[PDB]
Amino acid sequence: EYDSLIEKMSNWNFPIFELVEKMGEDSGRILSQVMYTLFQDTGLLEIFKIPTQQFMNYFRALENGYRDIPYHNRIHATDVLHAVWYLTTRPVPGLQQIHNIAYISSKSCSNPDESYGCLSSNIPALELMALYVAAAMHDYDHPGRTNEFLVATNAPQAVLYNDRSVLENHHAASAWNLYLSRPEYNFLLHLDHVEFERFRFLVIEAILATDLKKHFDFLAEFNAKANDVNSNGIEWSNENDRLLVCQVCIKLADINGPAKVRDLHLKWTEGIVNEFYEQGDEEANLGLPISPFMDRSDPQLAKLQESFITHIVGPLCNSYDAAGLLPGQWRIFCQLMHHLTENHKIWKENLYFQ
Amino acid sequence: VEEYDSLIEKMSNWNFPIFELVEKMGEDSGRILSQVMYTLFQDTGLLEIFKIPTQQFMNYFRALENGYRDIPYHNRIHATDVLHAVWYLTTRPVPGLQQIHIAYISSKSCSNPDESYGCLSSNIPALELMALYVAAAMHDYDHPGRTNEFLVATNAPQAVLYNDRSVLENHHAASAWNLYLSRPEYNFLLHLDHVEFERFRFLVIEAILATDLKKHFDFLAEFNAKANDVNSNGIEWSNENDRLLVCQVCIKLADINGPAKVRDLHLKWTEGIVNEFYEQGDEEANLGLPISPFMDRSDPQLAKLQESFITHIVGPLCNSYDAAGLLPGQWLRIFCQLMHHLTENHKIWKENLYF
Ligand SMILES: *B([O])(=O)C1=[C]C([N]C(=O)C2=NC3=C([C]=[C]C(O[C])=[C]3)C(O[C])=[C]2)=[C]C(C(=O)N([C])[C]C2=[C][C]=[C][C]=[C]2)=[C]1
Numbered sequence: 081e082y083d084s085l086i087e088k089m090s091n092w093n094f095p096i097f098e099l100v101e102k103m104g105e106d107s108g109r110i111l112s113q114v115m116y117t118l119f120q121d122t123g124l125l126e127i128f129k130i131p132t133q134q135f136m137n138y139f140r141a142l143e144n145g146y147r148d149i150p151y152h153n154r155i156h157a158t159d160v161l162h163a164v165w166y167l168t169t170r171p172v173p174g175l176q177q178i179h180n181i182a183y184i185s186s187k188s189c190s191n192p193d194e195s196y197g198c199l200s201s202n203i204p205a206l207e208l209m210a211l212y213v214a215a216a217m218h219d220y221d222h223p224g225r226t227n228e229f230l231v232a233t234n235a236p237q238a239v240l241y242n243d244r245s246v247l248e249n250h251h252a253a254s255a256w257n258l259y260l261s262r263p264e265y266n267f268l269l270h271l272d273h274v275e276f277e278r279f280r281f282l283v284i285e286a287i288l289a290t291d292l293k294k295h296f297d298f299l300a301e302f303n304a305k306a307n308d309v310n311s312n313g314i315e316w317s318n319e320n321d322r323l324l325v326c327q328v329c330i331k332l333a334d335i336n337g338p339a340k341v342r343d344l345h346l347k348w349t350e351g352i353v354n355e356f357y358e359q360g361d362e363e364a365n366l367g368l369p370i371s372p373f374m375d376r377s378d379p380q381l382a383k384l385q386e387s388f389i390t391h392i393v394g395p396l397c398n399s400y401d402a403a404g405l406l407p408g409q410w411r412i413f414c415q416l417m418h419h420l421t422e423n424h425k426i427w428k429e430n431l432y433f434q
Numbered sequence: 435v436e437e438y439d440s441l442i443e444k445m446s447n448w449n450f451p452i453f454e455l456v457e458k459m460g461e462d463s464g465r466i467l468s469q470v471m472y473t474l475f476q477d478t479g480l481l482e483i484f485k486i487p488t489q490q491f492m493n494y495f496r497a498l499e500n501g502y503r504d505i506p507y508h509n510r511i512h513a514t515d516v517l518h519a520v521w522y523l524t525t526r527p528v529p530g531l532q533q534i535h536i537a538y539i540s541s542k543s544c545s546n547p548d549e550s551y552g553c554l555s556s557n558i559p560a561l562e563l564m565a566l567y568v569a570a571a572m573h574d575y576d577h578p579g580r581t582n583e584f585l586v587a588t589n590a591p592q593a594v595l596y597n598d599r600s601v602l603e604n605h606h607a608a609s610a611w612n613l614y615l616s617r618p619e620y621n622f623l624l625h626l627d628h629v630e631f632e633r634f635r636f637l638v639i640e641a642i643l644a645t646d647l648k649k650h651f652d653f654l655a656e657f658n659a660k661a662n663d664v665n666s667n668g669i670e671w672s673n674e675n676d677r678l679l680v681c682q683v684c685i686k687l688a689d690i691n692g693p694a695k696v697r698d699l700h701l702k703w704t705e706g707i708v709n710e711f712y713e714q715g716d717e718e719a720n721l722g723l724p725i726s727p728f729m730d731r732s733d734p735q736l737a738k739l740q741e742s743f744i745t746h747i748v749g750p751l752c753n754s755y756d757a758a759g760l761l762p763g764q765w766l767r768i769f770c771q772l773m774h775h776l777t778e779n780h781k782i783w784k785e786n787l788y789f
């Protein structure tokens with residue numbers, strides 16, 4: 081069954097909802113199973129001597145922490161995990177290779193020629209494992225509400241974190257609290273104190289970058305280092321530069337919807353607006369002003385998708401592509417860039433005509 | 435009424451003998467923070483500007499000061515001292531500082547001698563200064579007497595809860611505001627609307643979080659870039675972010691005002707902080723952890739600690755705050771009292787180290 085699933089995930093437009101339907105009764109374990117296959121594929125199980133039992137124990141507990149809410153659930157976490165894996169292992173045109181300090185190489189694809197390069201050849205294995213694990217944790221115990229909702233309500237979580245990245249801090253904090261909750265979860269037992277401390281730091285930094293209030297800040301920092309005409313781009317020997325690359329990568333993965341085929345894009349859109357409408361129902365019941373795009377009476381779906389693709393997803397993918405980090409094939413053809421522009425065009429048509 | 439004038443006259447000195455005050459209070463020394471908060475708010479007029487009812491004010495700040503533990507340094511007296519320091523630095527006349535005036539406060543304890551002098555109270559709105567004072571009151575609430583490095587190394591519950599990023603400061607702000615929202619008998623800001631209260635909470639949280647010394651050099655760099663630029667015009671007082679940065683630097687200076695005081699208060703605070711250090715070192719040794727620097731009572735190295743702290747932490751902060759022209763003083767050249775204290779203490783401890 082391992083070969084079957086890994087071949088289906090080699091496609092960027094991985095039909096994940098077909099997988100959830102295929103698992104059916106055991107669909108609650110999709111995040112743990114996908115974690116196992118990807119770590120065996122990248123070889124992370126053998127590189128860090130990760131025991132299978134503790135690995136599976138923690139991530140079954142982790143996926144149990146995801147609620148049964150429309151969007152921020154196990155399937156969203158599985159999708160973001162798949163996206164970061166694809167973006168870091170697949171060949172990127174014109175990118176130079178360095179080591180292909182441990183580095184991974186995906187058994188699912190080899191660089192077709194020297195003109196292609198992989199991010200796995202430029203970022204150490206420890207840093208990439210943090211990105212994958214952070215993708216698994218990045219929305220742990222999401223209550224289906226926004227940060228702005230919690231701060232307006234003065235919810236306990238918002239007061240506990242002083243309104244600064246409420247959901248994202250809680251995700252990382254409660255995930256790591258779960259990790260340290262039982263010795264049967266310590267699958268990193270073969271990492272020393274320095275390596276484990278650094279791993280935790282990288283995971284926490286990756287999770288906190290998923291906050292969209294800091295979106296434009298991360299975008300500015302990434303363009304200064306990579307997309308500067310007078311600078312030498314990204315120095316892969318720099319620890320801070322690699323961290324910035326990983327943070328921008330996971331940001332793109334957490335909002336990959338518009339960068340997929342319209343089928344998957346619309347499915348994810350359906351989920352997130354259903355979560356929005358549940359929050360809007362509660363806002364109305366509490367006598368609070370309904371947040372924008374959260375009233376099921378006046379949806380304004382076209383305006384929501386159009387502004388989100390144009391102001392958030394658009395500039396992020398264009399910056400990531402201008403830096404030469406998107407996987408594709410030789411002009412250059414980029415799959416998700418074509419999907420992103422196609423989805424943006426359709427939603428502009430729906431907006432202008434309706 | 436009679437005790438009010440005595441205390442307000444005693445606090446007008448930069449070297450306010452606060453330990454004489456705790457000795458005078460004796461049995462009721464636990465309410466020093468609440469008494470000083472009430473006295474300062476009555477002096478600055480914040481009680482009447484925001485229509486603060488006395489009962490809820492006193493209730494909340496008595497609970498707040500009760501939240502401080504009986505530890506050598508991070509206690510009620512430290513919070514009271516930081517509050518006094520920010521009050522002095524924001525109300526007292528500064529040579530060459532411009533005056534401007536949205537409500538603003540003016541301390542009844544002093545008036546600007548002439549137009550060549552200016553007060554921060556005349557340039558920063560009353561809401562932001564009240565936020566700074568309240569943050570000084572909260573800035574070390576429920577401090578357990580350990581360092582951030584100790585909590586992250588131990589994987590303490592607080593350190594895991596805040597993801598190792600400014601654990602103690604986040605805890606201070608969060609538990610202080612939870613206490614404020616714990617009971618309706620604490621809501622003394624009930625005459626502030628939603629926007630004013632949200633802004634006040636934001637300013638308080640930023641001021642509290644700025645006290646982290648891990649972010650010290652970052653705040654110092656931003657302040658030198660904005661204020662201490664030779665080609666720039668310093669601080670634009672109409673800018674919200676500039677005023678926030680000024681207040682953050684002010685409370686940072688207040689949180690470590692020791693070396694900028696007379697030798698008596700400096701050495702008393704040094705005794706407190708090194709006793710807390712030695713307790714943490716005892717616990718680190720019992721747990722088999724490497725003893726943090728200057729926290730082993732067997733090898734104290736007190737002179738090296740004082741000199742490194744003055745040269746690397748207090749020194750550059752005071753020099754940046756003075757170069758921006760925000761330190762209260764008197765014309766002559768300009769004489770700044772705490773600059774004189776700081777240079778005197780720095781010379782004394784450099785002598786103790788070299789000899
Ligand atoms: B709490 O949170 O507030 C804290 C505190 C501190 N402090 C110190 O250290 C000191 N202080 C002082 C002095 C003198 C005088 C005074 O008065 C006020 C004060 C001294 O001398 C020596 C000292 C601190 C803290 C912290 O943070 N830690 C300890 C850690 C670190 C280290 C190094 C660097 C940074 C940080 C807190």
Ligand SMILES: [Mg+2]
Pocket residue numbers: 152218219247290
């Ligand atoms: Mg999220």
Ligand SMILES: [Mg+2]
Pocket residue numbers: 152218219290334
């Ligand atoms: Mg997410």
Ligand SMILES: [Mg+2]
Pocket residue numbers: 573574602645
């Ligand atoms: Mg503190």
Ligand SMILES: [Mg+2]
Pocket residue numbers: 512516573574645689
């Ligand atoms: Mg303090």
